């Protein structure tokens, strides 16, 4: 067929190429005679090996341009740019579509590094990140203690450049890093430790104690929490007894040679940086009984009613009971008879008879002590 002008069949395609690696910008054209190919970087002639065999750019018989390496530095940049191939034969000129030849880049320092988080168990946890500068744009991923982290958990959600934990479990604690990845490689960010702190609480709390005079007293107290909580005893109404207290290694409070006045309430206090827990117990000093009111010997006329007063005060409130001098039968606060004992301790004999004559013993007792006193009854006409 009679000679024809050039017609570009294949055009050069845009290309992003890794730091120092060969590149190929394809360009095929038809025409008779075979059209000579020339490359132009923004209109300027590209000096190839088919111009000077010292240039790192090679023009192929297939009309394609091969780059043996990519030149990108702080002083020179002759490979990066916009290219067009031109097919020229006996009569005619063909110009192709343009193509880009950009160097792939990925910097070191991050646009935003993940920061540490100190939360309580259950509180949500968020982590912010932005990858280091890079073209094409780097893709964000996360790692927990070397191993890669997944969105798989219902709570864990990775969106854009954020990490969200809806509720924290102790198991989420650890060292976290943000990974930026494009074609150049990977960049692992700065370590952002996440700590799951527990508020203070009591494993074993104090028990209310009743202890008599001169005996020692013990109040047990064990606490938990992360970080390990400091444990310190209080005295709600004053201070601890100088030279009479001792805080053991187990955290238990001991008051030696107890004397009334110690009688009150003591508090165990557990405290850490995330919270504070308190627990109370009372100490009961037990004083032996003493007679407020003692019965007095009295004469009652036949058939009338007599009351013998007996009132006592001790710690705890001491119980009271009567008994006739020779008898075994003990009289308490209610079968019924003419004899009765009031709640406060008084004995009342109703419709008296000559048989009722004699001493009536009053007896008070509590865990600490016991006291006795009597009074005579004289039945007359
Ligand atoms: C590349 O071709 C486009 C048309 O697709 C044109 O807009 C642009 O100016 C050309 N680029 C250069 C640097 O000449």
Author numbering: 63 to 396, 401 to 447
Sentences from the paper on this structure:
Roundabout (Robo) receptors provide an essential repulsive cue in neuronal development following Slit ligand binding. The Drosophila and vertebrate Robo1-3 are most similar, containing five immunoglobulin (Ig) and three fibronectin (Fn) domains in their extracellular region. Here we present the crystal structure of Robo1 Ig1-4 and Robo1 Ig5, together with a negative stain electron microscopy reconstruction of the Robo1 ectodomain. These results show how the Robo1 ectodomain is arranged as compact dimers, mainly mediated by the central Ig domains, which can further interact in a “back-to-back” fashion to generate a tetrameric assembly.
The Robo1 Ig1-4 domains are arranged in an extended conformation, ∼170 Å in length, with essentially no polypeptide linker between any of the four domains. Two potential N-glycosylation sites at N160 and N175 were identified by sequence analysis. A close inspection of the electron density for these residues reveals clear glycosylation at N160, while N175 is most likely not glycosylated. Nevertheless, four crystallographic contact interfaces are observed. The first results in a dimeric arrangement between 2-fold symmetric molecules along the b axis, and is primarily mediated by the Ig4 domain. This interface, which spans residues 378–394 and 429–436, has the largest buried surface (663 Å2 of each molecule's surface area), and is predominantly hydrophobic in nature. The last interface, which buries 466 Å2 from each molecule, is mediated exclusively by residues 71–72, 86–96, and 122–126 from one Ig1 domain interacting with residues 79–84, 115–120, and 128–131 from the second Ig1. Both interaction surfaces partially overlap with the Slit2 D2 binding surface on Ig1, but Slit2 D2 binding to the first is more extensive compared with the second. Several independent ab initio runs yielded reproducible molecular shapes, and the average models generated are consistent with the Robo1 Ig1-4 structure obtained. The fit directly computed from the atomic model of Robo1 Ig1-4 yields a very good agreement with the experimental SAXS profile and a χ2 = 1.4.
